[PDB]
């Protein structure tokens, strides 16, 4: 089974400010790679496909790289309601995995 | 407006099985294979199986080999999920999902989540 790492359970930042979450497999899943976002009470939400592109109607602050073993979500200038939950996810070979999370807080 | 309805909440007492349903509107059913997740506070999301209304296959995740049993109705539009002899361990939220393209496997349509809670 593939295992997907995120590193950080919980990641400070600020509004106004960027960030960078970081996931990475045990194996190379090339680029069959998803990010999604949750919000408690919610269903995650798909924000990036294949590894580095952009769902339809996820904002331009949304970004994500890799293609290979390590995948970097990143957040241009985060905003109040990106102090969410962001999951990591393999879909390259079955069994599909996902990353145990990181959730963004603010900093104080 | 694509879009995945999940049913109510689930209080179960060990043993005895439950079954889920997903009604999925604004798309013809059969084009797509649903998908089911599992979300727990601590263990995360897991990734259970899926299932095709085009002839009725079930690929299943190891993990849930026994506990899950993928069925779908046609003409229903609605996918099911039975769950096998909860025990606590089985007690969390889960999730419908279905792909939004055809050439990634990300889920993008989710149903709401169905909370199963086993307690007797």
């Known amino acids: 089974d593939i295992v997907m790492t995120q590193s950080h359970k919980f990641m400070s930042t600020s509004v106004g400010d960027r960030v960078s979450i970081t996931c990475k497999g045990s194996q190379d899943v090339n680029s069959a790679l998803a990010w999604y976002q949750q919000v408690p009470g919610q269903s995650p939400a798909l924000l990036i496909y294949?590894?580095?592109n952009r769902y339809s109607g996820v904002p331009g602050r949304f970004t994500a790289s890799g293609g290979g073993t390590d995948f970097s979500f990143t957040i241009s200038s985060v905003q109040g309601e990106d102090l969410a939950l962001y999951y990591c996810?393999?879909?390259?070979?079955?069994?599909?995995?996902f990353g145990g999370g990181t959730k963004l807080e603010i900093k104080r | 407006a694509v879009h995945l309805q999940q049913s109510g909440t689930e209080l179960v007492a060990p043993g005895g099985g439950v079954k889920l349903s997903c009604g999925a509107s604004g798309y013809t059913f059969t084009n797509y294979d649903m998908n089911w997740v599992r979300q727990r506070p601590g263990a995360g999301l897991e990734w259970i199986g899926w299932?095709?209304?085009?002839?009725?296959?079930?690929r299943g995740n190891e993990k849930f080999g026994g506990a899950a049993a993928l069925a779908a109705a046609a003409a229903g539009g609605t996918a099911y999920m039975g769950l096998g002899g909860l025990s606590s361990e089985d007690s969390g939220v889960y999730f419908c999902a279905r792909r939004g393209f055809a050439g990634a496997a990300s889920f993008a349509y989710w149903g709401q989540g169905t909370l199963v809670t086993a307690g007797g």
């Open positions: 294949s590894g580095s």
């Open positions: 299932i095709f209304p085009g002839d009725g296959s079930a």
């Open positions: 996810q393999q879909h390259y070979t079955t069994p599909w995995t």
